[PDB]
Amino acid sequence: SLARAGKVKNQTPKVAKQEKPKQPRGRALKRLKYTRRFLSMNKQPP
Amino acid sequence: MTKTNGQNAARKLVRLRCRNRWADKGWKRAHTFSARKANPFGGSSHAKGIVLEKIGVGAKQPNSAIRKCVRVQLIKNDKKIIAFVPNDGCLHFIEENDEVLVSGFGRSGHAVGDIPGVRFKIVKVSNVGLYALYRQKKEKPR
Amino acid sequence: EVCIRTSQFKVNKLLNRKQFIVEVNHPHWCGTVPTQLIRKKLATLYKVPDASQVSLFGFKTKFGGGKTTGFGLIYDDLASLKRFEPNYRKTRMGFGKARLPARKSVKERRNRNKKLRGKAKG
Amino acid sequence: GVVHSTKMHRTIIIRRNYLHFIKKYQRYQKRHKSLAVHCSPAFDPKQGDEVVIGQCRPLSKTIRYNVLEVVSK
Amino acid sequence: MRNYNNFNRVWKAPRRPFEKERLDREMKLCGQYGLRCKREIWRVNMTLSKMRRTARLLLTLPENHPRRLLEGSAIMRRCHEYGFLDEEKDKLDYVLSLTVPDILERRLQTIVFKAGLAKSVHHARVLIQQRHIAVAKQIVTIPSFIVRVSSERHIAFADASPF
RNA sequence: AUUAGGGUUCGAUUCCGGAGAGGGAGCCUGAGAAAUAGCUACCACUUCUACGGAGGGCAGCAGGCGCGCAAAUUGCCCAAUGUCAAAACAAAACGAUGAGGCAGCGAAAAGAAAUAGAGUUAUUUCAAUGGGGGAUAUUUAAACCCAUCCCGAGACAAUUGGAGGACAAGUCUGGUGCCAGCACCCGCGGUAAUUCCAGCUCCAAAAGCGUAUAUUAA
Ligand SMILES: [K+]
Ligand SMILES: [Mg+2]
Ligand SMILES: [Mg+2]
Ligand SMILES: [Mg+2]
Ligand SMILES: [Mg+2]
Ligand SMILES: [Mg+2]
Ligand SMILES: [Mg+2]
Ligand SMILES: [Mg+2]
Ligand SMILES: [Mg+2]
Ligand code: NA
Ligand code: NA
Ligand code: NA
Ligand code: NA
Ligand code: NA
Ligand code: NA
């Protein structure tokens, strides 16, 4: 059964990642995290 | 009850511990020079070999699948082992008479997962990492 | 507008000199204070006949700026300086011997003559 | 030490017995050592007696001590 | 080869890398004081631990002992100098109550924020890194500078700074 | 190194001691050697030649070849630390030193720290500059680096593993359909996959993060 090698990965549709604005790095990212959680988890739409 | 408690009985306690220490499978393997003699790698962490054939090993029940494996011959000691090609569709990077780098699977001799009797894994082919080619971060030489 | 302060002063009659640590303060400069300016000011403050007889070396500019520290020597005569000073220090100050040829060429020449005997040697 | 054997000519074997302490088990251990000593004709020690010996220069392949005193029984 | 310069480590990763109660408590401290990574918090945990074990060994095992009068006042002198302990309290038992926030207060980045020079802890960080702040006429660029209580009234702006 | 205590484990490697200079013997000189950048002989390798003959010993420093999963420049200098000695430095007039120093290569390991900040009605206003480029200069045996001063922003754009449980984080959306594959363990996939392949979002550590093999603790 060596014929079916990479059967799925060679047939999935091709999609491209979107372009998004960059995020702050270093201590400028931790403040972004602290701003959301404290001083008002991943919920998905139904 | 099961011990000697004399004040001048240190010789008996020393011999009791020395003899009973051989019942440890882990301790005896470390202290026996016959260890690493049956180990194909010879005690090292990695080894290089030449790919000679491609095989397909069935999965143990209750799992049904064909695991893509490769038979290689080591260079340092000229032994024969069976290795595993992990990622999806990665069999096309490996050809016969190719130099590869082989490492362990993670349990130090024991088999891993539903693959029966396989304890090695392919991590590099033709001097370039297998996962690097899988992510297309590099290209196959020649 | 720089100010020179001297600390740990000693008199060396054995080598005919005085050794001390020189500290320099300044408010703002276009970089670092040249060693010649400290030399000229050191001669005036200590009243030496010739400014070419005081040697300075090893200057470290402190972090933040506005301060340097080093070592200095004042010789009694110009002849004393030309006699007791290392060849590299006096080469910075102008009067020094020429640099000898490369050491590699000396080693090959010396080894070549080790096989000969009598004349044709050096 | 104690005289252990007097089967040679002007030579005896003495034995020293002591206890050795093993740190891990906090208990003692019986050990011994044997020395060859030169016995002068001034002394006539018997087996089991206690003697006092003193160090000297090498007198033979194994002898480095000399008998200086003998305590009866 | 033939080099005798020394070096050691100053922090230690925690056991159990996925405790929920520890993860959120550390996040409060990191954003409250403007720290960049969790390595800063783990560094303070190491020095605090070293203080405690010295006191506990010295506390009651040796009793009144020349090894207790010595380095029993040195630690108090050390603790009082930086402000990690109350002036009134002068027994070795009261150094065991030191906490992580107390040491984090006596930081150059924190002191500037509470002195009114900087509006926010993140603004204080950029000022120190820009050489706009000096202590006793000395430019300081290290936000981890533990300010001693004697120099508390000496911190001000820098002469060479535009401010 | 780890560990509450008791212990377990490593130590070829900077200081001290022992032994060796391809293998094995023998010896001269000398205060001191059974010396090897001294001698003599044999064995195994090996070089030049006009064929008569004569040579070699990098487990010194750089460099090569092989061996392997695995380890730098055929660089500069005696300026510092020392050794030797017929010897202090200068004056026609500079002792040697691959010991040693100091630059290159070098995410072993270890410290400090960038990737902005304050406001305005969501969208425009300020100030500050460090990477970088230069300097009468400083450093240095000469260099270098570093420090010090001055043309320069709001692409100079952070990654590595994960999201059923252990264990922090999706009942999100396509594709496949016990196939491909995932999975350290338990276990997912047989046409409605919380686990495969992708998109979005989220989580952990962060200039670091996974994997393999030994070891300590558990
Ligand atoms: K020298
Ligand atoms: Mg400035
Ligand atoms: Mg041992
Ligand atoms: Mg040695
Ligand atoms: Mg070499
Ligand atoms: Mg390496
Ligand atoms: Mg060297
Ligand atoms: Mg996914
Ligand atoms: Mg959870
Ligand atoms: Na050892
Ligand atoms: Na020797
Ligand atoms: Na040699
Ligand atoms: Na001379
Ligand atoms: Na340097
Ligand atoms: Na263990």
**CB < 8 Å to A31, chain E:** 31, 34, 122
- E38 Cβ contact list (under 8 Å, min separation 6): E26, E30
Give backbone dihedrals phi and psi of D65, rounded to 5 degrees, phi first: -135, 160
DSSP string, E98-147: --HHHHHHSSHHHHHHHTTS-SSHHHHHHHHHTT-EEETTEE---TT---
- In this complex, the nucleotide whose C1' atom is nearest to the CA atom of residue C31 is F149
List the single residue in A with minimal CA-CA distance to E120.
Answer: A31
Q: Is the CB of C97 under 7 A from strand F?
A: yes
Where in the sequence is the domain holding A24, given as residue range(s)?
Answer: 1-46
CA of E1 to C1' of F105 (A): 17
Best CA proximity match to B92, nearest among B138, B140, B58: B140
- A32 Cβ contact list (under 8 Å, min separation 6): A23, A24
Question: Distance from CA of residue B38 to its chain's centroid?
Answer: 11
- DSSP-based three-state secondary structure for E3: coil
Token readout for E95 is 């150094």
How far is residue C35's CA from residue E143's CA, in Å, rounded to a whole number?
35
This structure was determined by cryo-EM
Strands D65-71 and D27-38: parallel
Contact indicator for B113, B140 with CB cutoff of 8 Å: no
Chain F: bases < 7 Å from a protein Cβ: 6-8, 13-15, 67-70, 76-80, 89-91, 94, 96-97, 100-101, 109-119, 127-130, 134-142, 147-150, 155, 157-158, 161, 163, 167-172, 174-176, 178-185, 187-190, 196-207, 211-215
Burial of B114 (0-12, 13-18, 19+ CB in 10 A): middle
Residue type, C112: R
Dihedral (C-alpha) C24, C29, C32, C37: value to the nearest 10 degrees? Answer: -60
Give backbone dihedrals phi and psi of C57, rounded to 5 degrees, phi first: -160, 160
For helices E73-82 and E38-59, the axis angle rounded to 10 degrees is: 150
CB pairs under 8 A between A and B: 19
Q: DSSP E strands: which ranges in chain D?
A: 2-5, 11-22, 27-38, 50-55, 65-71
- DSSP-based three-state secondary structure for C81: helix
Residues 13-42 of chain A sitting with CB below 7 angstroms of strand F: 13, 15-18, 20-22, 24-29, 31, 33, 37, 41-42
Nearest 5°: the CA angle B83, B89, B95 is: 55
Best CA proximity match to C29, nearest among C58, C67, C55: C67
**What domains can you pick out in chain C, each with its CATH number?**
1-121 (3.30.70.3370)
Q: Which residues pair with B104 in a beta bridge?
A: B120
User: Across the interface, do D30 and B8 touch by the CB < 8 Å criterion?
Assistant: yes
Residues 62-101 of chain B sitting with CB below 7 angstroms of strand F: 62-68, 74-76, 86-89, 91, 101
Count Cβ atoms below 10 Å from residue E112 Cβ, excluding itself: 22
Number of separate domains in chain A:
1
How far is residue D47's CA from residue D63's CA, in Å, rounded to a whole number?
19
Task: Report CA-CA distances (Å) from C13 to C18, C75, C80.
Answer: 8, 10, 11
Question: Distance from CA of residue C90 to its chain's centroid?
Answer: 6
Token readout for E87 is 């002036």
Task: Report CA-CA distances (Å) from B109 to B38, B40, B119, E98.
Answer: 11, 10, 6, 49
Token readout for C78 is 């110009």
Burial of D67 (0-12, 13-18, 19+ CB in 10 A): buried
Strands C17-25 and D11-22: unpaired
What secondary structure letter does DSSP report for C36? H
DSSP string, B50-105: EEEEEEEEEPPTT---EEEEEEEEESSS--EEEEE--STTGGGG--SS-EEEEEE-
Contact indicator for D38, D67 with CB cutoff of 8 Å: yes
Measure in Å the smallest separation between the Cα of B23 and chain D Cα atoms. 21
CA of E1 to the centre of ligand 7 (A): 9
Residues 17-46 of chain B sitting with CB below 7 angstroms of strand F: 30, 43-46
CA of C104 to C1' of F61 (A): 14
Question: Distance from CA of residue C119 to its chain's centroid?
Answer: 43
CA of C59 to C1' of F44 (A): 63
User: Across the interface, do A5 and B91 touch by the CB < 8 Å criterion?
Assistant: yes
CA of C73 to C1' of F102 (A): 27
Give backbone dihedrals phi and psi of B94, rounded to 5 degrees, phi first: -95, 130
